[PDB]
Amino acid sequence: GALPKGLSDLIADPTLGPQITPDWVRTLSRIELRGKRPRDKQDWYEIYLHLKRILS
Amino acid sequence: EGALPKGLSDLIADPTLGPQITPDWVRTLSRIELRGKRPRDKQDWYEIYLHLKRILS
């Protein structure tokens, strides 16, 4: 896959994944700081929930 | 849309909060958007920055 591994993990999670739309995957996939990214699926979900409240 | 969100420009120009945002952070934050929608005002950007900085160490 071409997504960060923790994000691919989140999308494959059968309870947490299905709610995350393709637009959100794209938004999340662009988050990086000199290649450092949220490291695991919990990190990605944590930022997703907070961003969703700002941007949805 | 502008490369640098206007609310993030406001954050960077803010004398109390602006100093904390390195140029790399500016460019990282500038890429956060959902279908062209971005965070609005300087405080919204700072709220995001604080949380994301803690996540990314």
UniProtKB/Swiss-Prot annotation, chain A:
Coiled coil: none annotated. Cleaved between Leu-33 and Arg-34 by the IrrE metalloprotease after exposure to radiation. Cleavage inactivates DdrOC, leading to derepression of the target genes. One of its GO terms (molecular function) is DNA binding. Keywords: DNA-binding, Repressor, Stress response, Transcription, Transcription regulation. Signal peptide: none annotated. The record marks 33-34 as: Cleavage. The keyword S-adenosyl-L-methionine does not apply. The keyword NADP does not apply. GO terms for cellular component: cytosol. Forms at least dimers. Interacts with IrrE. Repressor specific for genes preceded by a radiation/desiccation response motif (RDRM) site, which is present upstream of several radiation-induced genes. This is HTH-type transcriptional regulator DdrOC. It comes from Deinococcus deserti (strain DSM 17065 / CIP 109153 / LMG 22923 / VCD115). The gene is ddrOC.
